[PDB]
């Protein structure tokens, strides 16, 4: 549920929770919210799982046939434009929790947030999740400008731990995702 | 004996007569050439004069499909404006769903799938237009592609269609092309443009020139005659 | 007249014979020999596949393409339009299987396919199928072997043969094969009539013998083909 | 035999033969290219070339190497116009199987789904048969590499090593004797025999920059091709 | 037998590949196969002499159709 | 290449008499790269002869002693090698081998009278295959005739 995206100079760093709860009952104890669209382009999903999977599968088919025909690097901004057009037309039906964060050869690491309205905007950091209401004051203070990939794993762990421990929906094991020119990096942390 | 009737059928020599008639159909039209420098791409069009004929600066074969892309076309003019709107509508689909500049490689590929398709069916007919596609971008660079009515997609540093003179592209290797900044290039091409295509065939003529590249920051427009004026300035004194 | 959507190109000759459909029989005659035998417990098929060059490996392309687990089949003559009706029969055999809940007999494959195959010949603008299908399998405890033609007419033969010199191999299958025999004896005379027009070289990849068991169709690998036929028949 | 207007459309003949389809035999001759496929134990190697009549030819744009999937590439012959329309269709059904099925693609039976669309091209009422010839490689799990060459009659074809085209008939003659007998195949052994099989045909033996050698070997399953570097080293390795 | 031996030259490969391209074009093209031995320039006819003789006449153009075999 | 063959060969002529035979064996890779190019027409025929010139000047040195002709079987090692990488295709410019071999057998004409027949027949058994490789090409056929008359 709770999702986080932070961009540093040479890429972006993503994180998400595992435990997902439908009502009072827990649907799944361990769930990976990151979507492997492409090696250089990831996103974080929330809300309805069925709506986030198919749209990610649609862009994978759309861009996949397009990007392979390009024989070009996987441009991040154009991939997020496919989410912008679809979430805007379906905004009265589909629910959009996708936030596109990925490293690009030309434009570097960038984060694009696409809320339920379908708009696309670039910011230095991204926030999301139901448990993010309590950390809104914490994310607007502890966050610093010009972060490093090292401390990005620490800061995303501080933002998720406060949201997962307080809010009842978010929880489980903490999983982080690091994106840079060296490729995809994932890890499992707890406590 | 009638093997040239259906455009969907082959020929006793194993080729398409509809395309063979379409290749020379573009040759009878006036010459429209193109060339690309390092930071830019240059276009040109010849305008023939028989009687008057009409106002200068009319029905020029130079068209602008997109911000960074342009059209140098030859052959039947009405078939070119139809492909100009198709390329314009295709450029509208790219700027909508995506919102950035359409790469010249796949922009020529979309038209390559079209021009090829009309040659396959006997219902419709092939195209009598062989045009030039070129563009420049900061993240791409200068490319130039030569499209033929048969539907083959490819490009060189330069190509020539229209009338068969072909001597206007000879002096280009005698001058600096990829080394030059594309500024003086405009007036360097126009020298033999006037010399060759002798006045015996056509008494008078008129020349159009267009350019797209870094100096315009990716924009494409026809170079005005008053600015920088050195286009036809150096062209008159270079005839010898 | 009308559209140009490919109205029927098939007309009637002054004697009433079909024009382009009878020409598809020439492709069957100018094709490759394929034989099959309906005897006793099940049906046995013997086809012929020979490589035009030494660089061809028969382990990839398979002549036998069974429609159902219990239904085998082979063909004669002409591939490109053959795979069209094959996969079409895969989609068509599902309505009988989903609605009636049953391993559809070969007789129903004959009625449905030959009707569409006849409708395909009636539709113009397209060349009729030059493929003569041998339909076999096991249903209701008694197997069947049925032969179709480009025109759609379906027959029933104990031992049948198609391809080059099919009238000569039909007389051999009329004499050497009679009444009914076991599947092992059926494979014997099925290769002997295939070795008629076959070249002087017979290996595991030169001939492939399919068999329809009462338990359902089982396609034999080239292993069992070289074991029984070496030493052909 | 021929009667009536059958010469002017695509259909059968009074003798049951074909004319249009058989005129596609020499449809490759106008291109005048050659492609030969050689497969090894763990590897598969394709050899092709291109013609450079003018120095303006760009190596990237006129490149005849087409890449369908990262793991599986391809190559074409004949006129390049009909080939490009089949390129996206080979990419289309590819992405369909990557999306829906999610694995290494029908390394064996993919030629059936492609030839089906290629047969629709032939089976259409009035349309061009598209005489371009499709050639694919393949990668499977513990099956070794695969090589497949499809022809635009609507049928699927592929084997260990196959060469079909203008001059490819003499190339297979050497491959029949070279493979067996009995022999194995290594990486450089298949690259060295890619020239020798063509050496029985023409092999002008000039600078390698014009010839393109496709290669796929299983270490990293992703298909890929180097640029100009060690291809010349493999050319001087086979000649001692 | 009228050709020079051919005690070295092995008839095995010439009864296969040249047999594919035969017209026929039967009787006296085999004599042309011997009339390319006078083209030599070689004491005992080379393998390239035979193969070159039959491959010129007559040509075949394949295969989009007969592939059913 | 023309200039490449003149600068390397004329600079290695001092290595023969002054320096040891190690540089003579180390002379192989550079002179081979010159023949790998094949810039021809007749230049490399004269270029590689300068090697074969001082190489026959080393025949005075080496083949006399020391000793046993093992240095000569190393010569045919790089005689076969010199024809390996060119490949020269029995051309053009293959005459660099004729005058070489003709001067090689000219030394063999002096060896039979100067030294016993044992080392020269091991030298003659090597050039029997050199003639099979030397065709049928010009005088190499009659260089076979003069050496086989000596064997009789």
Swiss-Prot record, chain B:
The keyword Repressor does not apply. The modification N6-acetyllysine is found at residues 52, 201, 225. Keywords: Acetylation, Cytoplasm, Host-virus interaction, Nucleus, Phosphoprotein, Proteasome. The keyword 4Fe-4S does not apply. One of its GO terms (biological process) is proteasome-mediated ubiquitin-dependent protein catabolic process. It comes from the Eukaryota. Transmembrane segments: none annotated. Induction: Down-regulated by antioxidants BO-653 and probucol. Up-regulated by bacterial lipopolysaccharides (LPS) and TNF. CDD domains: proteasome_alpha_type_3. Its main location: cytoplasm. It is found in: Cytoplasm; Nucleus. InterPro entries: Ntn_hydrolases_N, Proteasome_alpha, Proteasome_alpha-type, Proteasome_asu_N, Proteasome_sua/b. SUPFAM superfamilies: N-terminal nucleophile aminohydrolases (Ntn hydrolases). It holds the Pfam family Proteasome. One of its GO terms (molecular function) is ubiquitin protein ligase binding. SMART domains: Proteasome_A_N (SM00948). The modification Phosphoserine is found at residue 238. GO terms for cellular component: cytoplasm; cytosol; extracellular exosome; nucleoplasm; nucleus; proteasome complex; proteasome core complex; proteasome core complex, alpha-subunit complex. Component of the 20S core proteasome complex involved in the proteolytic degradation of most intracellular proteins. This complex plays numerous essential roles within the cell by associating with different regulatory particles. Associated with two 19S regulatory particles, forms the 26S proteasome and thus participates in the ATP-dependent degradation of ubiquitinated proteins. Belongs to the peptidase T1A family. PANTHER family: PROTEASOME SUBUNIT ALPHA/BETA (PTHR11599). This is Proteasome subunit alpha type-3. It comes from Homo sapiens (Human). The gene is PSMA3.
From Swiss-Prot, chain D:
GO terms for molecular function: endopeptidase activity; NF-kappaB binding; purine ribonucleoside triphosphate binding; RNA binding. InterPro entries: Ntn_hydrolases_N (IPR029055), Proteasome_alpha (IPR050115), Proteasome_alpha-type (IPR023332), Proteasome_asu_N (IPR000426), Proteasome_sua/b (IPR001353), Proteasome_subunit_alpha6 (IPR034642). The modification N6-acetyllysine is found at residues 98, 100. Glycans are attached at residue 1. Signal peptide: none annotated. The 26S proteasome consists of a 20S proteasome core and two 19S regulatory subunits. The 20S proteasome core is a barrel-shaped complex made of 28 subunits that are arranged in four stacked rings. The two outer rings are each formed by seven alpha subunits, and the two inner rings are formed by seven beta subunits. The proteolytic activity is exerted by three beta-subunits PSMB5, PSMB6 and PSMB7. Interacts with ALKBH4. SMART domains: Proteasome_A_N (SM00948). Component of the 20S core proteasome complex involved in the proteolytic degradation of most intracellular proteins. This complex plays numerous essential roles within the cell by associating with different regulatory particles. Associated with two 19S regulatory particles, forms the 26S proteasome and thus participates in the ATP-dependent degradation of ubiquitinated proteins. This is Proteasome subunit alpha type-6. It holds the Pfam family Proteasome. Belongs to the peptidase T1A family. The gene is PSMA6. The keyword Lipid biosynthesis does not apply. Its main location: cytoplasm. It is found in: Cytoplasm; Nucleus. The modification Phosphoserine is found at residues 13, 59-60.
Swiss-Prot record, chain E:
The modification N6-acetyllysine is found at residues 48, 52. It is found in: Cytoplasm; Nucleus. Component of the 19S proteasome regulatory particle complex. The 26S proteasome consists of a 20S core particle (CP) and two 19S regulatory subunits (RP). The regulatory particle is made of a lid composed of 9 subunits, a base containing 6 ATPases including PSMC4 and few additional components. Interacts with NR1I3. Interacts with PAAF1. Interacts with TRIM5. Interacts with ZFAND1. Component of the 26S proteasome, a multiprotein complex involved in the ATP-dependent degradation of ubiquitinated proteins. This complex plays a key role in the maintenance of protein homeostasis by removing misfolded or damaged proteins, which could impair cellular functions, and by removing proteins whose functions are no longer required. Therefore, the proteasome participates in numerous cellular processes, including cell cycle progression, apoptosis, or DNA damage repair. Belongs to the AAA ATPase family. This is 26S proteasome regulatory subunit 6B. The lineage of its organism: Eukaryota, Metazoa, Chordata, Craniata, Vertebrata. The chain holds residues 350 to 418 of 418 of the full protein.
Curated annotation (Swiss-Prot), chain F:
This is 26S proteasome non-ATPase regulatory subunit 12. Component of the 19S proteasome regulatory particle complex. The 26S proteasome consists of a 20S core particle (CP) and two 19S regulatory subunits (RP). The regulatory particle is made of a lid composed of 9 subunits including PSMD12, a base containing 6 ATPases and few additional components. Interacts with ERCC6. Belongs to the proteasome subunit p55 family. It comes from the Eukaryota. There is a cross-link at residue 92 (Glycyl lysine isopeptide (Lys-Gly) (interchain with G-Cter in SUMO1)). Component of the 26S proteasome, a multiprotein complex involved in the ATP-dependent degradation of ubiquitinated proteins. This complex plays a key role in the maintenance of protein homeostasis by removing misfolded or damaged proteins, which could impair cellular functions, and by removing proteins whose functions are no longer required. Therefore, the proteasome participates in numerous cellular processes, including cell cycle progression, apoptosis, or DNA damage repair. It is linked to Stankiewicz-Isidor syndrome: A neurodevelopmental disorder characterized by delayed psychomotor development, intellectual disability, behavioral disorders, mild dysmorphism, ophthalmologic anomalies, feeding difficulties, deafness, and variable congenital malformations of the cardiac and/or urogenital systems. The modification N-acetylalanine is found at residue 2. The gene is PSMD12. There is a cross-link at residue 92 (Glycyl lysine isopeptide (Lys-Gly) (interchain with G-Cter in SUMO2)).
